[PDB]
């Protein structure tokens, strides 16, 4: 399956800050549309706790070293490496895997080179402080821009890159 | 005069990395046009050394605490706050000031809220390590997207933002 990263950030590359509601209405609807199409989302435990509940119409895979039994078929607490995660979803018939976050989770998939496309939303802000897209890692990735789209009047931008 | 930031970065927000030749010539020509139109470039001493010499047809203002007299009329070593630099250039009839870089210089101008527009080029890469656009500072800036332009088939993107 191909791995797709889905994230929103400010112009400086941060995925979280203390700025209230900087995430646009448009990015939120675009996010639901994209991830439901893919049919699954892989996230870190901390990101799951912030969302608070499983996202509807999608298989929610939550990474945690303290797996918890689940009563919901669309919620799975998983203890494994990025590679293990991809194998598990592939075994479910998914062609694409949507990794939606946790700086920690983005970092792990990057260190392991498991990323084929980046669906990036750039919100019109500059945050002086915040949580970076990922922690330092050796190497880099050349990209190719597949699509660019303005999502609203203020300038929220949706970019789609393929990893070369 | 209004302060304009001109920078190129990868998708993760870094203005420099160990990767060779990641700067596109299209960005370089676009940079040449914009900065010569503005007529001046304000930069940190390190950036100056890396460029290798005064950029032609532009007043080059090199920020430094250890000032050196200059023979060249279009090269000035300046010691002072970002506010003093603007004052100095305004006194010379400039309406716009082009701050072209150095993580330290961008940080200083941001801390002082002296910035009106951002002329940002996003090169199609993700760097694992590198120098960030700026070091932490208090607050943030909401922006409005004025213009978006693709510079090459690979995906180099030029974005123009207004502050606040
Ligand atoms: N702007 C955006 O688009 C997004 C922003 N975010 C933001 O980023 C922050 C979250 O980032 P971050 O805290 O780094 O990461 P996460 O919070 O998403 O998850 C961290 C945790 O996930 C678990 N985990 C990670 N990797 C593995 C693995 N290989 N195996 C098992 N468990 C694993 C661990 O859980 P345990 O401790 O249980 O063992 C770890 O504590 C939040 O502020 C959130 O708002 C999140 C998504 C998107
Ligand atoms: N991608 C891009 O668009 C750009 C990338 N860069 C990259 O970023 C790096 C440069 O970042 P960084 O080193 O932080 O900064 P700079 O290299 O631009 O400048 C550092 C210097 O500027 C001087 N300086 C800074 N603030 C002041 C002040 N308030 N008053 C007086 N002098 C001051 C100091 O001079 P002194 O010590 O002599 O007194 C210091 O040595 C380089 O690797 C370069 O390649 C640079 C520009 C653009
Ligand atoms: C905090 N968080 C993480 C979050 C937010 N925006 C993002 N935006 C992008 N582009 N990418 C991400 N990974 C991302 N992650 C959240 C919080 C809520 C919902 C959420 O309610 N979900 C609805 C969205 C729908 C709405 O507002 O209709 C969904 O069903 O997908 C998703 C993610
Ligand atoms: C390392 N450096 C800093 C540099 C490079 N690209 C950037 N690109 C952007 N968008 N913004 C910056 N601040 C920036 N800074 C350099 C190195 C050379 C020249 C340079 O030769 N100058 C010619 C360009 C000429 C060409 O290729 O015709 C110029 O007249 O501006 C400029 C900046």
Curated annotation (Swiss-Prot), chains A, B:
Residues 2-164 form the DHFR domain. GO terms for molecular function: dihydrofolate reductase activity; identical protein binding; NADP binding. It is an enzyme of class 1 (oxidoreductase). InterPro entries: DHFR, DHFR-like_dom_sf, DHFR_dom. Pathway: Cofactor biosynthesis; tetrahydrofolate biosynthesis; 5,6,7,8-tetrahydrofolate from 7,8-dihydrofolate: step 1/1. It catalyses: (6S)-5,6,7,8-tetrahydrofolate + NADP(+) = 7,8-dihydrofolate + NADPH + H(+). One of its GO terms (cellular component) is cytosol. The keyword Oxidoreductase applies. One of its GO terms (biological process) is tetrahydrofolate biosynthetic process. NADP(+) binds at residues 8, 15, 45-50, 64-66, 80, 102-104. The keyword rRNA-binding does not apply. Keywords: NADP, One-carbon metabolism, Oxidoreductase. Substrate binds at residues 6-7, 27-29, 53, 58, 100. Its EC number is 1.5.1.3. Highly thermostable. Key enzyme in folate metabolism. Catalyzes an essential reaction for de novo glycine and purine synthesis, and for DNA precursor synthesis. Homodimer. Belongs to the dihydrofolate reductase family. This is Dihydrofolate reductase. The lineage of its organism: Bacteria, Thermotogati, Thermotogota, Thermotogae, Thermotogales. The gene is folA.
């Amino acid at each position: 399956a191909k791995v797709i990263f889905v994230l929103a950030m400010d112009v400086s590359g941060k995925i979280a800050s203390s700025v209230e509601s900087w995430s646009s209405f448009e990015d939120r609807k675009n996010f639901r549309k994209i991830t439901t199409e893919i049919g699954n989302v892989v996230m870190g435990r901390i990101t799951f706790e912030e969302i608070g509940r499983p996202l509807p119409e999608r298989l929610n895979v939550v990474l945690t070293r303290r797996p918890k039994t689940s009563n919901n078929p669309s919620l799975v607490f998983f203890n494994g490496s990025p590679a293990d995660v991809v194998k598990f979803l592939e075994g479910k018939g998914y062609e694409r895997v949507a990794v939606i976050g946790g700086k920690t989770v983005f970092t792990e998939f990057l260190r392991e080179k498991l990323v084929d496309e980046l669906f990036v939303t750039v919100e019109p802000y500059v945050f002086g402080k915040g949580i970076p897209f990922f922690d330092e890692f050796e190497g880099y990735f050349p990209l190719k821009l597949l699509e660019m789209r303005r999502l609203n009047e203020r300038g929220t931008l949706f970019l789609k890159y393929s990893v070369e």
